[model samples]
Target: GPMVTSTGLLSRVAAVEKAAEIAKPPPPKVVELTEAAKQLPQHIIGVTDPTKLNAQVSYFQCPPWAALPSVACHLQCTRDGLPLPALGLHRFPFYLFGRSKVCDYVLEHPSISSVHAVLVFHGGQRCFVLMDLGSTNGVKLNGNRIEKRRPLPAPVGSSIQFGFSSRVYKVQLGPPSSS
Candidate 1:
């Protein structure tokens, strides 16, 4: 049997493809990239959920709407050299230097009051952000004093000192965007 074709078949296929493309939502409208925008992944690394962060599916279990790959911090100082087990960080009013194990980075010094401070991300400034909690001695970033809740800047060579005599935590942020 001979195959029959409609004269408008190609036009119909093209129209359908165009319609499908139009149905998809457009990307962001920003003309220029800000520092933070640059920091954001070109393509989202994990599932749609923000909470899952970066978790390896191998030998790992993640709840639905979860995670990233190769996204995390390298820790040093009292805990020695190691990358944090979790991806992302508590750039929020997140806690640290606490008796509870829930802290992102725990410091067990007496002068280091419980829930000492927070680490924030500073867009493309190429610096560290320090958020001080209402602590006894106060928080210092790269030897500078920060008011309670005020943000402090720490560059590549900077170190976050919870107290004058307490251990200093050197932050190793994610490498420059090459991937």
Candidate 2:
């Protein structure tokens, strides 16, 4: 047998590796809403009555849904697009709230009761907070009780469980919204 050396073999291997990387495709792009979106009404589930009106119902006032594009941009650049080398995804925290007598204000308002989760982004923080207003039963984060008045710090990409009389409500945090 004769020995043969091929220069094209190296290039072929490199090309195949590059193609494989591109073929896998990056993970789904996750974009978080803006702090203002916190004010806006979010899609909530498990409500028995959607038409019922609550005087205390307060919805996000500014930057209506029309601003979703811009809001999405902020999320992608801040904490959604790529994970930082040092912080990982812990940079964003989701706050959870359980049924508190104080949060009754939300129940009283028909519009607000339907809101199962509220995205709250502090002015200077890197993550948004999810507060489960005191419902008939209560809200829990990883089996922990959510304090009243005080917002519980929930890490981003975490699961939130809402306790009800018969069942529990679960919500997953996507990313921290930018203010």
Candidate 3:
């Protein structure tokens, strides 16, 4: 018989190894939400009870129910479509820090703030960094414009904003994932 090369056995073993590696769960990324953002909701309430607002705030990790009463922040979903109840805000924070002081007043006083974008805290998986989405009002990270419906690396201690409002949110840094 002519020389018969056994490619099946070697290929099978290599394929199995590759599959295993691909199936392995990836390490969790570290995400940070700034204080500016945190303060937004509190400012909106303005010495009022946040629970009264009935706003839904989402974050990377499921916020403890205790924190709920005082902070009004709640958990959001992960990027992988995971139903993790990460903490978040039901309403966006509007302020007049730059040139739109008057406009900020209009957005907050009447309390017409809508859900412009959903900010997700993904542990630094992409470029070992965090990011946000422009679900509304054109999200901004540290004064830089982030496109809508996209993820952009969020810098620690940066101001994240939605829409064209002058108000900005301070991000808070969260611990690495235990999972």
- Cα lDDT of model 2 by residue, 1-179, tens digit: 68886766433222211111111223433567776356544343123133221222342221232212211212211223343232222232222232222232233222223434544443334334455555444556644766533454443444344543222222233445665
User: What is the Cα-based lDDT of residue 29 in candidate 3?
Assistant: 44
lDDT of each residue in 1-179, candidate 1, tens digit only: 68986676443222211111112233445557677465553233333233223211111222222222233454456433444352334333222454333345654455555456655454445344556667777877676666776767664546677764555666666665555
Root-mean-square deviation of every model: 23.9, 20.0, 21.7
Per-residue error for 115 in candidate 3, Å, reads 2.7
Cα error, residue 26 of model 1, in Å, equals 40
Winning candidate number (TM-score): 1
Badly placed stretches (over 4 Å) of model 2 are 1-113, 164-179
Per-candidate clashes come to: 2, 14, 38
Q: What TM-score do all the candidates reach, one by one?
A: 0.42, 0.30, 0.28
Runs in model 1 lying further than 4 Å from the true structure:
1-95, 171-179
The alpha-carbon deviation from the true structure for residue 152 of candidate 3, after best TM-score superposition, in angstroms, is: 2.7
- Tell me the whole-model lDDT of each prediction, alpha carbons only: 0.48, 0.36, 0.37
**What's the lDDT for candidate 1?**
0.48
Candidate 3: misplaced stretches above 4 Å? 1-113, 124-137, 172-179
